[PDB]
Amino acid sequence: SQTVHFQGNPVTVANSIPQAGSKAQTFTLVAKDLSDVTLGQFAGKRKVLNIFPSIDTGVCAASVRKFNQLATEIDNTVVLSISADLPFAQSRFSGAEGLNNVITLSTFRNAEFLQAYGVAIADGPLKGLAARAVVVIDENDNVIFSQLVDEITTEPDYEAALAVLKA
Amino acid sequence: SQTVHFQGNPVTVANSIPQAGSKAQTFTLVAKDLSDVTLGQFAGKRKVLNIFPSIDTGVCAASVRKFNQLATEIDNTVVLSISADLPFAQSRFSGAEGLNNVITLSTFRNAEFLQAYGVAIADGPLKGLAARAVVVIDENDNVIFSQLVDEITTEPDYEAALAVLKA
Ligand SMILES: [Cl-]
Ligand SMILES: [Cl-]
Ligand SMILES: [Cl-]
Ligand SMILES: [Cl-]
Ligand SMILES: [Cl-]
């Protein structure tokens, strides 16, 4: 169990976000066309999981775009923008500014992902949503960076997260 | 279980939709501000449950408004607009101008409701979403009308629903 903050209140987050060195667990999440997508179909690539409570709450489009562009400019990298938003809402966010290698995935029917990756908000009003977090997974499916953002509405340390992909 | 259609492909819907003459079961769902709300909140009213696979896809906001308008104009009536969309998406669909007596309610952390009410899509691409359905409940919690819509992307029999409400 972890504690982050929202609206000046403690928020319980289940289990533990994997620390660098951890084997990244398998998952299935849902793509914009409602097909199932697995961690395993990104074999060989490094993966940046940008995880949000929602893409309709608290997030600025232009911020997320800029990170997405910096991330996908790094060699052999895919960004997985993950939230409990249905796929239809994640597609409004991504409108017609989808760059290469930025892939939206929903946890709406794969809640076990949030447990496994230690991002399941367990209480308060955001209960059932993903906490704000960034997990970077290497080409061998080992986590090489993670941040569970302590204040849920603030921005993750995107710089530290990408620095790891240079090495 | 039940069978409806989506893209002319059968879609399995769990359990059974409440039948005419049955008592409506208690539920909790989430309002636009992330508070929980119960069926008990509407004690004394007639309730029209307008149940969607999504509000963000293949639904016409303008046509839903006309129905909401007609329904809410019947005395002692509330329309509960229910989906698995997050409350944030439902609040976009709704606008700053969604009338009184139309409450948006999300099932995203209350999956049991869709099972209880016989509207949980159990397979194919829409798995995890609510089937298209209308359930009318009278002031004494009796289901007086219900429709599980055979073709998911078509409109419910609203006229029939308003008639049972006016009767
Ligand atoms: Cl996998
Ligand atoms: Cl932090
Ligand atoms: Cl952010
Ligand atoms: Cl209740
Ligand atoms: Cl029908």
Q: How far apart are CA B20 and CA B54, in angstroms?
A: 25
Identify all chain B residues contacting A92, using CB atoms and an 8 Å cutoff.
Answer: 56, 92
- Give catalytic status of residue B6 as yes or no: no
**Both tokens assigned to A86:** 């249905």
Q: State the distance from the centre of ligand 1 to the C-alpha of B125, rounded, in angstroms.
A: 19
- Which of A89, A127, A129 has the CB atom closest to B56's CB atom? A89
**Both tokens assigned to B116:** 């209880």
Residue B62, C-beta contacts closer than 8 angstroms, at least 6 positions apart: none
The three-state secondary structure class of A162 is helix
How does DSSP classify residue A89? H
**Amino acid of residue B2:** Q
Nearest C-alpha neighbor of A109 from the set B107, B91, B11, B153: B107
Experimental technique = X-ray
- Which of B33, B54, B86 has the CB atom closest to A56's CB atom? B86
Q: Which of B35, B60, B96, B100 is catalytic?
A: B60
Angle ∠(B60,B126,B152) on CA atoms, nearest 5: 45
Q: How far apart are CA B33 and CA B91, in angstroms?
A: 9
**Both tokens assigned to A69:** 């562009």
CATH class of B1-167: alpha beta
Identify all chain B residues contacting A128, using CB atoms and an 8 Å cutoff.
Answer: 108-109
Strand-strand pairing, A9-13 and A28-30 = unpaired
Angle ∠(A57,B88,A152) on CA atoms, nearest 5: 30
**Both tokens assigned to B57:** 């896809």
| Residue carrying structure tokens 């829409």 | B126
Identify all chain A residues contacting B56, using CB atoms and an 8 Å cutoff.
Answer: 86, 88-89, 92
| Residue carrying structure tokens 């609203």 | B158
* Breaks (C–N over 2.5 Å) after residues, chain B: none
CB distance from B59 to chain A under 8 Å? no
Domain boundaries, chain A: 1-167
**Both tokens assigned to A81:** 């923008």
Residue B40, C-beta contacts closer than 8 angstroms, at least 6 positions apart: B26
**Amino acid of residue A11:** V
- Quickly list DSSP for chain B: -EEEEETTEEEEE-S-PPPTTSBPPP-EEE-TTS-EEEGGGGTTSEEEEEE-S-SSSS--HHHHHHHHHHHHTSTTEEEEEEESS-HHHHHHHH-TTPPTTEEEEE-TT-THHHHHTT-BB-SSTTTTSBPSEEEEE-TTSBEEEEEE-SBTTSPP-HHHHHHHHH-
CB distance from B82 to chain A under 8 Å? no
CB contact under 8 A, A127 and B108: no
CB A144 within 8 A of CB A134: no
Q: Which of A44, A60, A95, A96 is catalytic?
A: A60
Q: How far apart are CA A9 and CA B105, in angstroms?
A: 24
The three-state secondary structure class of A58 is coil
The three-state secondary structure class of A18 is coil
Strand partners, A11: A4
Q: What is the resolution of this structure in A?
A: 2.1
